[PDB]
Design a protein around this ligand. Sequence first.
Ligand SMILES: C[C@@H](O)[C@](C)(NC(=O)c1ccc(C#CC#Cc2ccc(N)cc2)cc1)C(=O)N=O
Ligand SMILES: [Zn+2]
Length: 302
Amino acid sequence: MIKQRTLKRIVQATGVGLHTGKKVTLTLRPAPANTGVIYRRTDLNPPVDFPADAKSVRDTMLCTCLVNEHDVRISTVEHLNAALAGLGIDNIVIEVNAPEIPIMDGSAAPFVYLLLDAGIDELNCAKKFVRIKETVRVEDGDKWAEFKPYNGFSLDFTIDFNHPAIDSSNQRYAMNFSADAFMRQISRARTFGFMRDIEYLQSRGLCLGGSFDCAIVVDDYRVLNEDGLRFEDEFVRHKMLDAIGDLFMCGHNIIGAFTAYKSGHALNNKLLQAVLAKQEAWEYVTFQDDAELPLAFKAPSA
Ligand SMILES: C[C@@H](O)[C@](C)(NC(=O)c1ccc(C#CC#Cc2ccc(N)cc2)cc1)C(=O)N=O
Ligand SMILES: [Zn+2]
């Protein structure tokens, strides 16, 4: 059978919150079958749990947040969420003693190492996949996102950037998903922002953890980070990272073809909810014999 996975052991890391600028301790814990991904704030007393759910998502000015029934929040979950998808973790408890997940270097890579430290435990319960059956499309003016039937998981992302530091040949990225491909091509791609906007946010006591160490920062003309970019098309690779984290909010790997033009957190989530709400458009599937498992969702080599 192709089994659900959780962590072998509890692991922990610290880092700075993007918003508060304060030290945040992150703890990742194993969890039983079918419980899914649960974000938990332990700064509040009692602790507050936020099950990863497409309906709970809110796209804030910076990054994304989950909310509960009373509009308490936990922010900056999507990069870590992308690593969960990348490594094929299905059940996990993620705790922070703060209102946000630490920003780290702005990519998913530090979470990759952290998850590898924790190990993998297979649970005796079938892993459920969401298989696309109808074509579903959502749009926001010029922008659109869609899913299409496909015996795999592919992503085709076009960003439209008329910034001098983003050349024409670097506005589109396409990949067939796999754990290895995510770790190698995507996980290290950093978030990015505009210096004047960051400056402004900080003059109002926001984005206090922002630094060159946690983001690519550009002014009107160029990248300001002294080491420059990790990839020539780092910007769009990061948007792909963000899309993987957005889609994994439903807690399941999706078998289908993802395509988006100028999409982002709001639209990708809008697609995720549109797909799920349209009952005929999708179905759960499991794999009794491993050999049925499409290559995209094979266990990571590492
Ligand atoms: C890319 C987007 O989709 C989005 C939301 N961008 C961000 O979340 C984001 C995160 C952080 C920053 C920043 C910063 C900074 C700084 C700074 C640098 C030097 C000094 N001296 C002071 C401050 C910007 C954006 C994103 O990553 N979404 O997943
Ligand atoms: Zn991001």
